[PDB]
Write an enzyme that holds these catalytic residues in place. Sequence first.
Site, PDB file in Angstrom:
ATOM      1  CG  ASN A 123      -5.403   0.472   8.257  1.00 16.98           C
ATOM      2  OD1 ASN A 123      -5.373   1.549   8.850  1.00 16.98           O
ATOM      3  ND2 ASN A 123      -6.201  -0.511   8.613  1.00 16.98           N
ATOM      4  CG  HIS A 137      -7.132   4.590  -2.704  1.00 17.31           C
ATOM      5  ND1 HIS A 137      -6.300   4.193  -1.732  1.00 17.31           N
ATOM      6  CD2 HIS A 137      -6.964   3.698  -3.760  1.00 17.31           C
ATOM      7  CE1 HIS A 137      -5.630   3.094  -2.131  1.00 17.31           C
ATOM      8  NE2 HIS A 137      -6.043   2.792  -3.374  1.00 17.31           N
TER       9      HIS A 137
END
Lengths: 182, 185
Positions: free
Chosen positions: A18, A29
């Site tokens: 997560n 990311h």
Amino acid sequence: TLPDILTFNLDIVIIGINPGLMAAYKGHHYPGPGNHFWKCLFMSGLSEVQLNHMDDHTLPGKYGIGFTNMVERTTPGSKDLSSKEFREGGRILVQKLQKYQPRIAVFNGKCIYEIFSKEVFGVKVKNLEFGLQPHKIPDTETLCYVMPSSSARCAQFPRAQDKVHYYIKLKDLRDQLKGIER
Amino acid sequence: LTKTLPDILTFNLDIVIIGINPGLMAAYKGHHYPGPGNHFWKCLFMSGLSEVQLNHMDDHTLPGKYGIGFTNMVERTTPGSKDLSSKEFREGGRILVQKLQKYQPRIAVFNGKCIYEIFSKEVFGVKVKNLEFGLQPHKIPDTETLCYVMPSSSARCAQFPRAQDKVHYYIKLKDLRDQLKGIER
DNA sequence: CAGCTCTGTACGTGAGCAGTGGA
DNA sequence: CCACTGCTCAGTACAGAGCTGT
């Protein structure tokens, strides 16, 4: 919290547990750059030059790689998760992947696949090792590839110099899979 | 939005602790100086300022029980102090001073030199020479509030590498406040 | 160079781990 | 579930250029 960079007909999809606190804050990311991801993506030859979280939206277009996670909820923190949550996540995951059907689903770190196997295939993997896994993504020709976690908390994988091999091998598999179109 | 840590502040307060701004964790946890790494709660206990050991969950009880408050120069959350605009600090101190002029705590404690070095340069317009921890000369404008500088409770600071290293200034802080309460008769 | 003003290094723990190997 | 091997991550003195002056 963190958005899914995903397209149709994709080589690799990276799949985290997560989004981390940083990730969530930075809006990209595998930021860090404690997380060894981008260095490995470079070193491996999967990227032309060195990159970073800011280049994340370019990855599928230029290098055919997507990004996502089991659970979208952000936390520290994996030990902060639960169980119920995971099972519901894999369900939400499987679906997304049944939609975009990438070539290879990559699991960032054994933990995430452990669960995923026991929940999606209902099989408790004995002595799991990194690499291709037997079973495919349900009703899909997407293979399951397990990579050691990019997270900078893995000491089996203390450096990004330590865990580059699997990325090289990952690249190869994509290539091998590209050949089977002839 | 993560997004914001609330000010625990009351009237007639002994100490107010003043951070740079709320860290990622802090913001997520919704409580002050969580961690670790923050030596704050350990020190708060170790110093004698708290009866027993506590933690970020106890932050809203501090004014009631121990007469301690919380706030930070800048409200915006980040990693991350090297992530903050020079102009943001100036707007912070301005906002802060106000708060203090309102709540008139006895002592404003500054977590870490950086935050005061700016606060002085911006509220007093003076760049302090070879700054040392402890009491500072000037009071909060229009107030009897003293300024006391502590080494950052955070743990990016190697001069105070352990929490054991930073305890002194809390002991000394206690003494100072007691001195100030003493003169209440 | 006595200070000085400025962007920029670089630095020590204790978590919190993800591993691998044991109770 | 531990013990453990190694990694990270969460401000501030210090370094040099680059100043005006006994």
